[PDB]
Amino acid sequence: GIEYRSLHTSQLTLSEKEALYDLLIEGFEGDFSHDDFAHTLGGMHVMAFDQQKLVGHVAIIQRHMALDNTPISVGYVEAMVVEQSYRRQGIGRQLMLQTNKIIASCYQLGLLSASDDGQKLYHSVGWQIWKGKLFELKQGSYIRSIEEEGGVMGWKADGEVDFTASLYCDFRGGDQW
Amino acid sequence: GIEYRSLHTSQLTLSEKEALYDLLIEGFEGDFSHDDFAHTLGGMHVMAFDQQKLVGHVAIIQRHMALDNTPISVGYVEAMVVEQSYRRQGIGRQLMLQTNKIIASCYQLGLLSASDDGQKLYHSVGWQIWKGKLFELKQGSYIRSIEEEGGVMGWKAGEVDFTASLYCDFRGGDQW
Ligand SMILES: CC(C)(COP(=O)(O)OP(=O)(O)OC[C@H]1O[C@@H](n2cnc3c(N)ncnc32)[C@H](O)[C@@H]1OP(=O)(O)O)[C@@H](O)C(=O)NCCC(=O)NCCS
Ligand SMILES: CC(C)(COP(=O)(O)OP(=O)(O)OC[C@H]1O[C@@H](n2cnc3c(N)ncnc32)[C@H](O)[C@@H]1OP(=O)(O)O)[C@@H](O)C(=O)NCCC(=O)NCCS
Ligand SMILES: CC(=O)N[C@@H]1C[C@H](O)[C@@H](CN)O[C@@H]1O[C@H]1[C@H](O)[C@@H](O[C@H]2O[C@H](CO)[C@@H](O)[C@H](N)[C@H]2O)[C@H](N)C[C@@H]1N
Ligand SMILES: CC(=O)N[C@@H]1C[C@H](O)[C@@H](CN)O[C@@H]1O[C@H]1[C@H](O)[C@@H](O[C@H]2O[C@H](CO)[C@@H](O)[C@H](N)[C@H]2O)[C@H](N)C[C@@H]1N
């Protein structure tokens, strides 16, 4: 009974972007900042609808990272949310199945930063904890992303990505992961 | 009778992706590498068609850069091409008008790397030579992108200082 649509940010209306913001604010219970919203704009949105009402969302952002010394094209997962009264029905799983398809068609590696509880959902669609060190840019130089190690997860089904290598992410505002 | 379509890489049929490869190889007369092709995948494609034949293309890739110390979200233009026999009919201009729309809706700044004899097209839809320093990552440290200074152009729908420094994100091949 839930319909799924994949739309680029450039294909959304202002009202649809606003409904997305509203869904994220309500679904994260105050844990979602203006920088977090910036992070979810510019790539592909997978949106779940009950009739015309938006009830679920995940976005896939293109990021450009280094894996040890090697450049790697990343599909970075942002702003995963399902409206509270619609949870535990499998919507989040369906959103990730669509997310995996987009990543497989476009990028060398999927990455996301998960809450300690939220890891089971991603693990159930094949994602694994990233085992290597994580780095981010601060004032133009790389530092260790100590707080994120153990929480970042990756995916590339049937690929040859070394999950024990270091990742060096690209720069943004707010949380870099 | 040229039709324009905007399609994410994830929405391209396999037929469209192969047609795109051929169009780029034929249109750039040998100066388009496998890294250049990797660079045009992962974002939005604006494609021009004569009936069912692909005859023009431009892609807009999301990149994450620094403007001086400030993080900025960039729409980066890649793989601009029109099949030779279709050129000088305004297709490239229309591709760029569509590109400007996509950038205005998604990103803080448009950037591209133009050839010395190929800046007039972008200038005619509002783009300007970037006047500040350009930097790229090598060995995980930023170095100057001297080659590109005077060739990279930017566009803001806007309050952006074109004399500020740009620090791009990492990739294979040409960083710009
Ligand atoms: C995380 C989130 C998006 C999951 O959305 P969801 O639609 O509830 O995800 P699913 O329903 O596919 O699976 C969720 C759980 O319900 C369970 N479930 C799904 N369908 C079920 C059913 N018919 N009967 C019983 N349990 C079911 C799944 O097994 C899973 O259990 P697990 O937590 O042990 O894996 C949602 O809780 C949310 O929006 N949280 C707030 C924002 C947030 O934390 N986002 C993620 C940041 S990492
Ligand atoms: C650059 C390129 C994409 C332009 O495609 P195009 O469709 O020819 O672009 P337009 O036709 O809109 O404009 C092209 C020229 O014709 C002129 N023109 C525009 N409309 C015209 C018309 N209706 N009749 C005649 N001339 C016209 C433009 O002013 C421009 O003149 P300039 O060469 O002095 O800028 C094409 O030359 C190409 O594919 N080159 C090879 C790949 C390449 O170099 N890409 C860009 C790298 S920066
Ligand atoms: C896949 C996804 O949708 N991800 C969302 C994006 C959203 O924009 C953001 C809103 N805030 O939340 C998630 O991403 C956060 C992570 O939640 C956060 O993790 C901390 O918070 C968790 C829950 O409190 C703790 O479990 C965890 N140990 C702790 O490190 C990371 N540090 C940064 C990362 N951007
Ligand atoms: C907007 C656009 O579609 N851009 C294409 C992308 C394409 O993937 C690539 C294929 N190769 O070409 C263009 O982008 C190149 C630039 O052409 C190149 O410019 C050098 O080559 C020019 C022509 O010889 C010289 O004029 C110029 N001085 C010289 O620096 C830059 N260094 C790197 C940059 N990725």
Residue numbers in the entry:
A (entry chain A): 2 to 178
B (entry chain B): 2 to 158, 160 to 178
Passage from the reporting paper:
Specifically, AAC(2′)-Ia utilizes cosubstrate, acetyl-CoA, to detoxify naturally occurring aminoglycosides such as kanamycin, tobramycin, sisomicin, and gentamicin, as well as semisynthetic aminoglycosides such as dibekacin, netilmicin, and plazomicin through the addition of an acetyl group at their 2′ positions.
Meanwhile, the crystal structures of AAC(2′)-Ia in complex with CoA and acetylated aminoglycosides describes the enzyme in three product-bound states. In identical fashion to gentamicin, the central ring of tobramycin is anchored by two hydrogen bond interactions, N-1 with Glu149 and N-3 with the C-terminal carboxylate of Trp178. Additionally, both aminoglycosides interact with the backbone carbonyl of Ser114 at their site of modification, N-2′. Aside from these interactions, the prime-ring of tobramycin also interacts with the backbone carbonyl of Asp32 and the side chain of Asp37 at the N-6′ position. The acetylated tobramycin in chain A also interacts with the backbone amine of the adjacent residue, Ala80.
